[PDB]
């Protein structure tokens, strides 16, 4: 996360990191058993880890979880990332606690202007790298539909959406991936691509969980 803040250990309770020997992508936890991330962090041998906040430090209120099982969604295109999205199932149930909890799917679509909290443990420089150890937050607001396509054009499908400031400066980045974009309540969003981070004119892209809901709650109910 670029030109955010540290959100305050848990205070991102939905917030997982996916651990393959390393944090590779964010997730948010959408039940006890299931994690919805993107699918161009789909990896074999998924460990989810829960309650995490320094990503590099035992604190004490972790969960450690090996993926059953990836569903990459049916039409997920690696080319374009139209359907970035993916869910893991979690080998055993996780505990829900205060700081293992899990986010609301949306029943319906946000508007353009409604704020959003992005978290993850990517890299927080513009123009280098510096990744934190522990969890940064940044809200920020969906973007119009024409300004999202006109940063990117004939790229942006309607399972997509931008959040972030034309201006540059704040933006998710590398290592935030699959990570939550969460608005009143609601998982809207997740971290999917973008044009190097906090650009101008560069707003992050995000998967359009509202497009989903139906797909990721039969998914659910079936595996
Ligand atoms: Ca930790």
Redesign the pocket.
């Known amino acids: 996360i670029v030109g955010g803040y540290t959100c305050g250990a848990n205070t991102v309770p939905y917030q997982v990191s996916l651990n393959s020997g390393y944090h590779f992508c964010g997730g948010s936890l959408i039940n006890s058993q299931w994690v919805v991330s993107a699918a161009h962090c789909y990896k074999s041998g998924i460990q989810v880890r829960l309650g ?8 004490g209120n ?1 969960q450690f979880i090996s993926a059953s099982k990836s569903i990459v969604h049916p039409s997920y295109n690696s080319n374009t990332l139209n359907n970035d999205i993916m869910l893991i199932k979690l080998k055993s149930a996780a505990s829900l606690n205060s700081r293992v909890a899990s986010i609301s799917l949306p029943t319906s679509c946000a508007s353009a202007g409604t704020q959003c909290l992005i978290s993850g443990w990517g890299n927080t420089k513009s123009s280098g790298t510096s990744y934190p150890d522990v969890l940064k937050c940044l809200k920020a607001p969906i973007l119009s539909d024409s300004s999202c396509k006109s940063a990117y054009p004939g790229q942006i499908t309607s399972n997509m959406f931008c959040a972030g400031y034309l201006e540059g400066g704040k933006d998710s980045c590398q290592g935030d991936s699959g990570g939550p974009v969460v608005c009143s309540g609601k998982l809207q969003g997740i971290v999917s691509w973008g044009s190097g981070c906090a650009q101008k004119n560069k707003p992050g892209v995000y998967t359009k969980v509202c497009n989903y809901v139906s797909w990721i709650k039969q998914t659910i109910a079936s595996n």
């Open positions: 995490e906040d320094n990503i590099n430090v035992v604190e972790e």
